[PDB]
């Protein structure tokens, strides 16, 4: 099976390097040419760069001239992009992309695809969040049915994961997308609707979980009293 | 060096028909330089649709064909399926041997009926009252089209600063959903009598409410 799988993305800051690879499996690689393209976020798929099959020639886009280098080791069924002098405006998920015919054909289109890796550039550091109960009230209660919830705020990076009751409970829940604040870190809210003549009675606790910097919160969520 | 301009968006109903231009220039199609098209979906990798202005590769169904004439290219799909709401992309050269992607097209396929925002505003926690901050959650869902109007208020005022709202996103049911958030001073939460959080969307406009303990 013909396969390619890229490698080496993450969060880095501005100004510093990070190469990603490009490994090759299910045909013979030497015999074709490979490109790089990337997409950043909100924005269409940009041409980044190439190399021939043979490694004796490559090509750049304007955007990263000079600063991105590609090369192949035609001993290892992969290939590489060097990244220098990385800038916020280069963050986007990268992929590698294979032409369909072999050796020095050109214009060839792109057949095989990998899923690609993402590369984020900022100044943010990594940091766990901080989570309140969003409580259960009049305001937005009996509709037969309440809402209540857990807004998981200011962490870095994405993403977080959450549950409620360990997973048990699985329906009525939904977890709304990050925003991206200004201030480069995310927030993100998770909600669930319940029968409002049990609450007090049935307790609700959410559970989050932020891999990157080895945070797990557990926060039960209870209707006040004012 | 030049450039590919596609339309940014186009529609049409299920079993109809559309087509997807690219137009480009002397520098690149109008130079004998070929066209490929490319059918994404972000979360998955692109896929090759047609290669060489009218070239089919097998496994691409009957339905996408295309064509090109002078400085321009244009994509034909018959039969429109739900299947088949996603991003496409001419590609070309130029004379440098830097392939170029044009803008990209997102079709939409119709048929959807209109759906109206289930909306929910939370105000601060004693929690992060306690911690000297306060942030107002307002969460919309459910809706179709994906397109919303997102305001907010401190009693009558419009209130502009410390307001971050996404852009929606379509669920797995194929509704979309968004959210706001504003920031506020535990002094400005209680020197008010309320806060709203309004949302319009075609033609409809709810509007839901907080105050401070305005218990009893």
């Known amino acids: 099976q013909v396969q390619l799988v890229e490698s080496g993305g993450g969060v880095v800051q501005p100004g510093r390097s990070l190469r990603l690879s490009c490994a090759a499996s299910?045909?013979?690689?030497?015999?074709?040419?490979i490109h790089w393209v990337r997409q950043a976020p909100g924005k269409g798929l940009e041409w980044v760069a190439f190399?021939?099959?043979?490694?004796?020639?490559?090509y750049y886009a304007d955007s990263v001239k000079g600063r991105f280098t590609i090369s192949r080791d035609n001993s290892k069924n992969t290939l590489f992009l060097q990244m220098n002098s990385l800038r916020p405006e280069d963050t986007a998920i990268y992929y590698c992309?294979?032409?369909?015919?072999?050796?020095?054909?050109?214009?060839?289109?792109?057949?095989?695809w990998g899923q690609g890796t993402m590369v984020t550039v900022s100044s943010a550091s990594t940091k766990g969040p901080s989570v309140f109960p969003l409580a259960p009230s009049s305001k937005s209660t009996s509709g037969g049915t309440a809402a209540l919830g857990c807004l998981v705020k200011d962490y870095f990076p994405q993403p977080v994961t959450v549950s409620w009751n360990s997973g048990a409970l699985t329906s009525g829940v939904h977890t709304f997308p990050a925003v991206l604040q200004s201030s480069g870190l995310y927030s993100l809210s998770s909600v669930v609707t319940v029968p409002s003549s049990s609450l007090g009675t049935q307790t609700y606790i959410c559970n989050v979980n932020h891999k990157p910097s080895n945070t797990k919160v557990d926060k039960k969520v209870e209707p006040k009293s004012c | 060096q030049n450039v590919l301009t596609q339309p940014p968006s186009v529609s049409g109903a299920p079993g109809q028909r559309v087509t997807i231009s690219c137009t480009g220039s002397?520098?690149?199609?109008?130079?004998?330089?070929?066209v490929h098209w490319y059918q994404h979906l972000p979360g998955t990798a692109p896929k090759l649709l047609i290669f060489?202005?009218?070239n089919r590769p097998s496994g691409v169904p009957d339905r996408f064909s295309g064509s090109k004439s002078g400085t321009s290219a244009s994509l034909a799909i018959t039969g429109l399926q739900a299947e088949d709401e996603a991003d496409y992309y001419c590609?070309?050269?130029?004379?440098?041997?830097?392939?170029?992607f044009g803008g990209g097209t997102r079709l939409t396929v119709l048929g959807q009926p209109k759906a109206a925002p289930s909306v929910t505003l939370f105000p601060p926690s004693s929690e992060e009252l306690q911690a000297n901050k306060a942030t107002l959650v307002c969460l919309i869902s459910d809706f179709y089209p994906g397109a919303v109007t997102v305001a907010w208020k401190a009693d009558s005022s419009p209130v502009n600063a410390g307001v971050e709202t996404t852009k929606p996103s379509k669920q797995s049911n194929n509704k979309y959903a968004a959210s706001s958030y504003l920031s506020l001073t535990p002094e400005q939460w209680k020197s008010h009598k309320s806060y709203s959080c309004q949302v319009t969307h075609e033609g409809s406009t709810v509007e839901k409410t907080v105050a401070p303990a305005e218990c009893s």
């Open positions: 992309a294979r032409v369909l015919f072999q050796q020095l054909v050109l214009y060839a289109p792109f057949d095989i």
């Open positions: 299910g045909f013979t690689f030497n015999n074709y040419a």
């Open positions: 190399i021939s099959y043979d490694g004796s020639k490559n």
């Open positions: 002397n520098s690149n199609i109008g130079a004998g330089f070929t």
């Open positions: 060489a202005n009218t």
């Open positions: 590609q070309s050269y130029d004379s440098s041997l830097s392939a170029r």
